[PDB]
DNA sequence: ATGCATGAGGA
DNA sequence: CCTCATGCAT
DNA sequence: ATGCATGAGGA
DNA sequence: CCTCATGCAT
């Protein structure tokens, strides 16, 4: 049976609180999941978990693995600023542009088409985090 | 004879440009200064150098050491947001408060006195960077 | 890329 | 205390 | 703490 | 192409 979104908030809040009190960094925890359970994770992922900056499914996948570490540790190419806001505006107009709208947006802002395609992919995926940028 | 501030801007701009083209990260360069010259530096320091976020003296100290690497590589406790703006306001009023103004500022914002003393130390020291936050 | 930190050295 | 060079952790 | 990225897997 | 989990580099 799955946690609620409230369960994950409170778990993340208490996980961070306890990780600090034990004297571990985010990078430490991520490495220890590799050491103890053969499933390493980066500082970036532990940080996002604590901020709920991951999808609900991802949050649910990591929670028991982080609960394991907690139980166990208790025992011891750059978009300009002006261009960035332009990408926003079109994202509210339409957040999933075609490969044709992307390729034209890339010239009107003088970005490579791949840069724009990936930027939209990422901005769509932040919208799906449990705590999105809004 | 010492570089001008313009010399250091252009050197930092060209250093970053060349470091990327060689395929090295900031952390790589910092470690290589230890490897090659027995003077290791952190990713943080290389990053600040490229952004001129260090004092003129510091910038001058690091430049020849980074010019060495370039020549050689060519061959191969958290202040709330609202509280933060309050610390600013008083910094313009007076940027070097006494240990008595510090200790009272610490209670009126419910921070530890050491936190406020260190915050002022750091905010004074950013004012001395070649590219300050302003 | 940066917030908060440390410690050597000095008035 | 401070300045100052410097970095861990995020 | 996060901007830009990759690659496995799927419609 | 996309979604999605994930991280290097800053």
Residue numbers in the entry:
A (entry chain C), B (entry chain C): 246 to 321, 506 to 563
Q: Would you copy out the relevant sentences from the publication that reported this structure?
A:
POU3 family factors (Brn1, Brn2, Brn4 and Oct6) have prominent roles in neural specification. Indeed, Brn2 is involved in the direct lineage reprogramming of fibroblasts to induced neurons and induces neural stem cells. Brn2 forms dimers with Sox2 in the context of neural stem cells (NSCs) reminiscent of the Sox2/Oct4 dimer in ESCs. However, the dominant motif targeted by Brn2 is the MORE motif.
